[model samples]
Structures are given as structure tokens and as C-alpha cells.
Target: YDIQAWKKQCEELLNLIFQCEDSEPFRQPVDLLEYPDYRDIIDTPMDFATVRETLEAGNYESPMELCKDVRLIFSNSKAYTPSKRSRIYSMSLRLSAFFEEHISSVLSDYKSALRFHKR
Candidate 1:
């Protein structure tokens, strides 16, 4: 698919993620004061806001590039919030699952379209 189509799908996916109940934690950058060690622990921090801005700026060359940051957001959360019982950790797990499922659907649809056009 073209970059425009990829961007549109990414924007739609981001909007859906933003609406998730557990999305608040990944919406913005982590508070340094609240988690001073966050920066130290996570080498590259990622958030939904940053992903949205990057998409609007046309920084991503492909859908997978944008998806990388989205996955990072959840991975960073899980890495920082060790305990499985922690709300943040669980939220990340749940949201990550949702994201994976939806992203797969989007990618599959793209591939299916390509196959149809090639036939």
C-alpha cells in the first residue's frame, strides 16, 4: 500500500487506542518526578502522543515504523512496572493485546487487497 493509505490506517488505529480505558497511562510521557528512574531504565521512551505527532509530521516511512513506536509504549510500561498485578502493567498487557489483534487485521486487509489487485 501507499504511504497515504498507511498513514490513514495508522491514524484510525491511534484514535481507537486513545479511546481505550487503559490508554491514559500511555497517552503522555512519563513524569520524571514520579518516576525519576524511568529515563534511566527505559532507553527509548514512547507514547501515543508522540506517535500521533510523528504520523502527522510524515516521519514514518512505513506502517511498521509507526507500529514499532506503538509497541514500544507497551513494552516500556511492562518493563518499568515489573509486577503483573500492577494496574499499569496489566493495562499495558491488555492494550498491547488489543493493538496486536487490530494491527494484524489491518495488515491482513492490506495484503488481501494487494493479492486481489495482482490477480
Candidate 2:
């Protein structure tokens, strides 16, 4: 008997628990608001790299959260909108890598757990 339906069930549960509908798009224009518009450091080697590192440190639970952090990083300065666009795009790619390395393993575990509930 196949309890493999549990895989889909687990997906539903993950969506419910994570409130996935709350997720945001990855490339929306970032608003600087009160955050520093670091045009001064925009050309510096460590500038965006440091911000990206900090946001990545958050170990965000989902792409949406990671995108939000990306928005924050750009907020400091879209001084070069082209540069900002490039950075934001890479943030999504980085997040995909993040998912593959960190989240896929957990989903794999969930699938493995489902195998135990055979019909």
C-alpha cells in the first residue's frame, strides 16, 4: 500500500505552517526610506558584498524572506539603478542556491518520513 499521498500532504502542511501566500516577489523596486543610501560605498569592494553577506546570515526560511532582505540591501542605495537591478537579480539566484543546500534536505526528510506511513 502506498502512503505516498503523504508527500503531497506534507507539502500542504508546509505551505500552511509557513503561510506561503505571504511571500513577496523577488525583484520589486526597493525603497530606501530611512536606510543609508550608501552611494559612497557603492563602488567599494566590500559594500554590497558585506550587505549580501549579512542578509544571507539570516538563513531566511523562504525566498520571500530572502527577497525582503535583498530589498533592504538595495535600500541603502540604488544610486545606480542598473547596478541595483543586477544585484537584486543575483539575490534570487543566491536564494535558489540557498534553497538547494538548506531547504531541499528538509523536504527530503519529510518525504522520507512519509514512507513510514504506508497504507
Candidate 3:
């Protein structure tokens, strides 16, 4: 019903995907792309495609499971080792809040509009 809202949500979620991984570290690493699997989730970043595929699969039972899937993508290796991780984790938190606020606000508005229509 709202393309702009959908676009913003997609952008926000994508931002979260990147920001979450970028916030995992403070600075440069030692070219750690081939890091150990057991430590990979924390040691690496994930891609949007991988997470999107997981969402499409519809196997996850909860939010945590979806997040875990994202983390697991990096559990086998690390990438973008030269990139810097933001200390504030700014985009991740902000976009998440924004998306939630947008969705909730719209949903509430939608309900109000429908209630008015029914009356």
C-alpha cells in the first residue's frame, strides 16, 4: 500500500545489516578473512544476499533466529577486513528504531482510518 514506507524499511534493514557487522570491531584487522569458524560469527561481517535468502527460506521461528542466520554467514570466514567498524554502531541502532517507529506509526494510523470507515 505504501511504496515509500517499504523502500524506507528495506533501506533501514539493509543499513542494519551493514552497521551490525561494522560495529563488531573498532578498527583494522590482520587480513582475517580466513578466520576460524567457531569465532567467525563475531569475527566477521555478513552480506545482504545471504540474509535475504534466509528470510525467503522462512525457516526461522523468531527474530533471534534471523539474526543468528546473519551471524552464521560470517561464522565460516571474515570479509572486508580493511574496513573500519564504527564505534558508535550508529546506523544499526538508528535505522532499527526508525523502521520500527515508521511501521508502528503507520499501522496505528491504518487502524484508525479503518475504524473510522467502519463507523
Report the lDDT tens digits of candidate 3 across residue range 1-119.
33223333434564554555443432223234544542444545454565555555754433444545444443322332323364334433443454455455544554565557677
Lowest lDDT 10-mer window, candidate 3? 75-84
Residue 85 in model 2: lDDT: 51
Per-residue lDDT tens digits for candidate 1, residues 1-119, read 43246668778888999999999988999989989888888999898999999989979876778778888897788788868799888888899888898788666666666667677
Per-residue lDDT of 72 in model 3: 41
Clashing pairs in 2: 37-76
Model 1, residue 110: distance off in Å is 4.2
TM-score ranking from best to worst? 1, 2, 3
**Residues 1-119 of candidate 2: C-alpha lDDT, one tens digit per residue:** 23233334334433442333222322223334533563444543223233334444754343344344434543433443446356544454454444345445545554465556542
Q: Local distance difference test, per candidate?
A: 0.83, 0.41, 0.44
Between prediction 2 and prediction 3, the one with superior TM-score is 2
Model 2 — which ten-residue stretch has the worst lDDT?
A: 20-29
lDDT order, best first, reads 1, 3, 2
TM-score of each: 0.86, 0.31, 0.30
In terms of TM-score, which candidate is stronger, 1 or 2? 1
